[PDB]
Amino acid sequence: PVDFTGYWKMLVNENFEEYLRALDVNVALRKIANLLKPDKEIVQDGDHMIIRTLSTFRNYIMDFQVGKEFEEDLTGIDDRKCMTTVSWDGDKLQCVQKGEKEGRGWTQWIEGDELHLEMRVEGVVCKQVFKKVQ
Ligand SMILES: CC1=C(/C=C/C(C)=C/C=C/C(C)=C/CO)C(C)(C)CCC1
């Protein structure tokens, strides 16, 4: 497939508040989250991927094998646990996070020189777009 490795800076973040509200994040944390601009630092070797979502407040780290289900600990976000699987769909990554909230997951892909991420939960869609600094 494709190599997502890079330090990607956020350009776009649409509907993040609604996405966090659907995860039951409290108003205090939503307030500070509202002014963050999380970046993505990704290192990949084939199906082995580390995706670090980096902000000045808190980071969220994923470390997984594409195609292999794992127990995802969402401490720092909503502090839930999911049965999560990230899969290749051509050159896109499709993530399903099974657990309390229905329809939770995300899709990540590169379009030209932009990293696109669509995060989903209970019918809410949050759109994020990132670019490396040339
Ligand atoms: C609310 C909240 C945050 C949410 C991070 C999320 C929702 C990351 C999702 C990452 C994905 C889907 C990576 C695969 O690209 C972070 C922890 C930044 C700071 C503390 C507040």
From Swiss-Prot:
InterPro entries: Calycin (IPR012674), CRBP1 (IPR031264), Fatty_acid-bd (IPR000463), ILBP (IPR031259), Lipocln_cytosolic_FA-bd_dom (IPR000566)
Locations listed in the record: Cytoplasm; Lipid droplet
Effect the entry attributes to changing Q108L: Strongly decreased affinity for retinol. Further decrease in for retinol
A cellular component annotation (GO) from this entry: cytosol
Cross-referenced Gene3D superfamilies: 2.40.128.20
Lineage top rank: taxon: Eukaryota
GO molecular function: all-trans-retinol binding; fatty acid binding; retinal binding; retinoid binding
Keywords: Cytoplasm, Lipid droplet, Methylation, Retinol-binding, Transport, Vitamin A
Gene Ontology biological process terms from the UniProt entry: fatty acid transport; lipid homeostasis; retinoic acid biosynthetic process; vitamin A metabolic process
Keyword Amino-acid biosynthesis part of the UniProt annotation: no
Family matches, as SUPFAM superfamilies: Lipocalins
Binding site for all-trans-retinol: K40, M62, Q108
UniProt-annotated stretches for the region Important for interaction with STRA6: 21-31
Pfam families: Lipocalin
PROSITE patterns registered for this protein in UniProt: FABP (PS00214)
Reported tissue expression: Detected in nearly all the tissues with higher expression in adult ovary, pancreas, pituitary gland and adrenal gland, and fetal liver.
Keyword Transport: yes
UniProt subunit comment: Interacts (only as retinol-free apoprotein) with STRA6.
Family listed: Belongs to the calycin superfamily. Fatty-acid binding protein (FABP) family.
Protein name: Retinol-binding protein 1
Species whose genome carries this gene: Homo sapiens (Human)
Organism ancestry: Eukaryota, Metazoa, Chordata, Craniata, Vertebrata
